[PDB]
Write a protein that binds this ligand. Structure first.
Ligand SMILES: CO[C@@H]1O[C@H](CO)[C@@H](O[C@@H]2O[C@H](CO)[C@@H](S[C@@H]3O[C@H](CO)[C@@H](O[C@@H]4O[C@H](CO)[C@@H](O)[C@H](O)[C@H]4O)[C@H](O)[C@H]3O)[C@H](O)[C@H]2O)[C@H](O)[C@H]1O
Ligand SMILES: *[C@@H]1O[C@H](CO)[C@@H](O)[C@H](O)[C@H]1NC(C)=O
Ligand SMILES: *[C@@H]1O[C@H](CO)[C@@H](O)[C@H](O)[C@H]1NC(C)=O
Ligand SMILES: *[C@H]1O[C@H](CO)[C@@H](O)[C@H](O)[C@@H]1O
Ligand SMILES: *[C@H]1O[C@H](CO)[C@@H](O)[C@H](O)[C@@H]1O
Ligand SMILES: *[C@H]1O[C@H](CO)[C@@H](O)[C@H](O)[C@@H]1O
Ligand SMILES: *[C@H]1O[C@H](CO)[C@@H](O)[C@H](O)[C@@H]1O
Ligand SMILES: *[C@H]1O[C@H](CO)[C@@H](O)[C@H](O)[C@@H]1O
Ligand SMILES: *[C@H]1O[C@H](CO)[C@@H](O)[C@H](O)[C@@H]1O
Ligand SMILES: *[C@H]1O[C@H](CO)[C@@H](O)[C@H](O)[C@@H]1O
Length: 362
């Protein structure tokens, strides 16, 4: 379980039964022939399991139990999970608001949430556990303080995240703090303030040994190393994730965080350029496809691994204007509709990702 260097080396990312179930029971029954066979393969690509609700915690243990059994059979698997239940979650948007609110004892609930997770990780110390810490949180504090919900959630976000990284700082764990993406914090003007924030989180948590680095492009679609700038990236020299991590990495070192590495989500980056009409359009973007398969052989000094954090097929937000959590971004002309609630299965989107996959599944 313990490691030195890249935590993705020496182990094999586990493909969870939750996503496998969604594909096999919600997607495959609608497909046939070659498509049905390609879809089955997708369910075997390792992706991160999101602990988006406390009700998901028993699932985390079930997954780890499955992994323990598999490793008993010669398996050498590692678990992959996303810590994502901050109070007043997704402060700059409306589609992914969570079950906890700062106003109603949210910080206390979050700590309880973290305690539940730590106890499971402690019980499964024998399993290498790779974690992404709170996607879509700190990034908002850099550019969205103009939004009341974010402005008022600052201290809670920092307090909760510090509790998460300090409590989950165990020898069998590798944590990557979410760091937005190239089109968000990658812009030269947002680089330094972002690096300072992340570095202050790291130092404020007493430089946790388990905090290996940052996670980028989570739930987004930027290419990892595309060579030609898409039209929508006009103005930003940092137009892919490689350029982004190589730009911010040195800045992290300047602010007290040295030896920080990265992992980048490529689960929906296979088709470039995407169908985005505006770079800031993040909801159920059309013209995307499954991308680079998870692997530690990145050939890049800063990237520990390509990963699939956001599970392709699970929606980014509802396109129903009358539904709760409706975010106008999900009704844009470059967003695939009709779309279900965030997290819910979106068959048409799964098919789009499968059809436009690169590497191909067909
Ligand atoms: C200037 O750059 C732009 O900045 C804006 C911010 O002002 C960026 O917008 C933000 O983009 C984020 C993605 O890049 C999304 S995150 C969003 O919510 C969550 C992830 O945080 C996802 O939903 C969850 O998915 C889980 C797994 O499927 C489920 O378990 C869970 O139930 C779901 O809630 C969702 O897929 C993501 O889309 C921000 O909402 C958005 O404001 C913009 O990206 C920059 O370009
Ligand atoms: C440091 O940790 C404390 C713990 O209470 C937290 O309140 C504070 O917001 C953290 N500061 C930063 C910059 O993360
Ligand atoms: C981008 O990365 C992938 C995976 O390592 C690699 O196969 C491809 O050749 C790279 N493309 C460029 C232009 O470097
Ligand atoms: C935990 O223990 C293993 C086995 O000795 C090491 O390989 C690892 O570096 C860590 O010390
Ligand atoms: C994890 O499991 C994979 C099997 O796909 C191996 O190839 C790898 O070496 C590790 O044992
Ligand atoms: C397997 O699990 C998925 C995700 O919960 C379900 O959608 C499916 O119906 C089955 O129970
Ligand atoms: C869901 O189950 C099917 C078989 O029923 C698999 O082919 C798929 O990969 C996923 O595990
Ligand atoms: C998807 O979920 C169904 C139950 O709804 C199973 O029967 C199937 O085997 C797969 O796990
Ligand atoms: C899979 O997708 C088909 C449409 O192609 C539906 O009819 C089915 O209910 C499932 O969603
Ligand atoms: C998808 O393709 C496989 C062979 O590659 C078949 O065995 C399966 O029945 C489906 O047609």
């Amino acid at each position: 379980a313990t490691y030195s260097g890249n935590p993705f080396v020496g182990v094999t990312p586990w493909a969870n039964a939750y996503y496998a179930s969604e594909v096999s029971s919600l997607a495959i029954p609608s497909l046939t022939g070659a498509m049905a066979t390609a879809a089955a393969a997708v369910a075997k690509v390792p992706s991160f399991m999101w602990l988006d609700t406390l009700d998901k915690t028993p699932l985390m243990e079930q997954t780890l139990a499955d992994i323990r059994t598999a490793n008993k059979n010669g398996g050498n698997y590692a678990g992959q999970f996303v810590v994502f239940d901050l109070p007043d979650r997704d402060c700059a948007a409306l589609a992914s608001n969570g079950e906890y609110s700062i106003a109603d004892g949210g910080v206390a609930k979050y700590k309880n949430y973290i305690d539940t997770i730590r106890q499971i990780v402690v019980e499964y110390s024998d399993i290498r556990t790779l974690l992404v810490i709170e996607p879509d949180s700190l990034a908002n504090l850099v550019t969205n303080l103009g939004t009341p919900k974010c402005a008022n959630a600052q201290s809670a976000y920092l307090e909760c995240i510090n509790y998460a990284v300090t409590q989950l700082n165990l020898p069998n764990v590798a944590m990557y703090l979410d760091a937005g993406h190239a089109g968000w914090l990658g812009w030269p003007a947002n680089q330094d303030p972002a690096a300072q924030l992340f570095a202050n989180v790291y130092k404020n948590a007493s430089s946790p040994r388990a905090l290996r680095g940052l996670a980028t492009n989570v739930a987004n679609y930027n290419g990892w190393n595309i060579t030609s700038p898409p039209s929508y990236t006009q103005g930003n020299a940092v137009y892919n994730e490689k350029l982004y991590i190589h730009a911010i990495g040195p800045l992290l070192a300047n602010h007290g965080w040295s030896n920080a590495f990265f992992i980048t989500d490529q689960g929906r980056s296979g088709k470039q350029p995407t169908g985005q009409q505006q770079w800031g359009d993040w909801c159920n973007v059309i013209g995307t496809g499954f991308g680079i398969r998870p692997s530690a052989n990145t050939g890049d000094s800063l990237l520990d691994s390509f990963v699939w954090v956001k599970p392709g097929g699970e929606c980014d937000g509802t396109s129903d204007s009358s539904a709760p959590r409706f975010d106008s971004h999900c009704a844009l002309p470059d967003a695939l509709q009709p779309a279900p609630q965030a997290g819910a299965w979106f068959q048409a989107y799964f098919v789009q990702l499968l059809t436009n996959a690169n590497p191909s599944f067909l």
